[PDB]
């Protein structure tokens, strides 16, 4: 009956699972709408390239950066794109403030089943990070390999 320490994924504790699902859905929807309002009109197009850089991948990157309180190298310039960005910025402010209000307290909840934060309490944060690094490495390597094969197809 010892007190149960928070899990590896205890950083998700401050928000309910439904909030996380709706955050993912809202992120996807905002990215899709931003890409749509930035790229659909032929009058935003000049081989031929767009007046803006907000493709679907770039829109997803911008939305992720906005939600992570980071920013990126691009920003919407049109009225509809800036409406999307501003409403997503307001959403991010509200959600991130609510999430980070009591994060440290959520990370050290001993349950029945002021002190410094310990590495264990954030160990799950590190694993994911390293996992991501590994994943990225794999992806990069795969691309290289693919291109190498293509180069062989070009060499024949």
């Amino acid at each position: 009956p010892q007190k149960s320490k928070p899990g590896v994924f205890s950083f998700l504790d401050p928000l309910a699972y439904e909030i996380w699902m709706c955050i993912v859905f809202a992120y996807i929807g905002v990215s899709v709408v931003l890409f749509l309002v930035s790229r659909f009109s032929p009058y935003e197009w000049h081989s031929s390239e767009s007046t803006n850089e907000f493709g679907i991948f770039n829109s997803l990157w911008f939305s992720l950066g906005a939600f992570m309180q980071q920013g990126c190298d691009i920003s919407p310039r049109s009225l509809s794109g800036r409406i999307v960005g501003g409403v997503w910025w307001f959403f991010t402010l509200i959600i991130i403030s609510s999430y980070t209000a009591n994060l440290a307290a959520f990370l050290t909840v001993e349950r029945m089943v002021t002190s410094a934060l310990s590495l264990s309490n954030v160990a799950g944060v590190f694993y994911i990070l390293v996992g991501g690094l590994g994943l990225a490495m794999l992806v990069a390597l795969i691309e290289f390999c693919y291109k190498s094969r293509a180069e062989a197809k070009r060499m024949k």
Binding site: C22, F25, I28, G29, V32, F35, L36, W45, S48, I56
Partner: protein
């Protein structure tokens, strides 16, 4: 690849429409403790709650969307949320928008000359995804207003939103490709 893109758009549109329709029609949205008689484990959807296991298994009863006595309607937010949840207007609107997008895709296939039909299909799919989001939020909020789980109809709706967004992106890409091809042909012919 344009044919492959059109095939993916059609398959995704049909899959999203079918998943949303099944989610709305079926009643495996929430497993929770309650009574289906008109407290045991029951599965409930947008309209009906039915007991599973026990001795009254298989009996379904319509969900009471306006419960409690004295009908405290002094506020407006609670009544509006209850009415929106009872009508399920947003899941049904998402279904309708998915159907409209599929119809637009088919009509564009018949015509193959009016590019604005592709744009309309993409707008319909994106709006269907947004309606799905609003309906999910309304459903969860009304449930809040005692351990529960979400059934396969709920995740059918979630997957329908995901697929609808992907199909909307694909349709916008096809519209952009059509207009770029038109501009390139105009440049080449002049």
């Amino acid at each position: 690849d344009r044919g492959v893109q059109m095939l993916l758009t059609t398959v995704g549109a049909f899959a999203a429409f079918s998943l949303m329709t099944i989610a709305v029609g079926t009643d495996y949205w929430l497993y929770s403790r309650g009574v289906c008689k008109t407290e045991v484990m029951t599965h409930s959807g947008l309209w009906r709650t039915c007991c599973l296991e026990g001795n009254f298994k298989g009996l379904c009863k319509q969900i009471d969307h306006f419960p409690e006595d004295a009908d405290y309607e002094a506020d407006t937010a609670e009544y509006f949320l209850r009415a929106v949840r009872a009508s399920s207007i947003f899941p049904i609107l998402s279904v309708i928008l998915l159907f409209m997008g599929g119809l637009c895709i088919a009509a564009s296939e018949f015509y193959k000359t009016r590019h604005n039909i592709i744009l309309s299909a993409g707008i319909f799919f994106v709006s269907a995804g947004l309606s799905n989001i609003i309906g999910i939020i309304v459903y969860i909020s009304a449930n809040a207003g005692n351990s529960y789980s979400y059934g396969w109809s709920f995740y059918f709706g979630a997957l329908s939103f995901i697929i609808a967004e992907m199909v909307g992106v694909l349709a916008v890409h096809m519209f952009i490709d059509r207009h770029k091809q038109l501009r390139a042909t105009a440049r080449a012919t002049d």
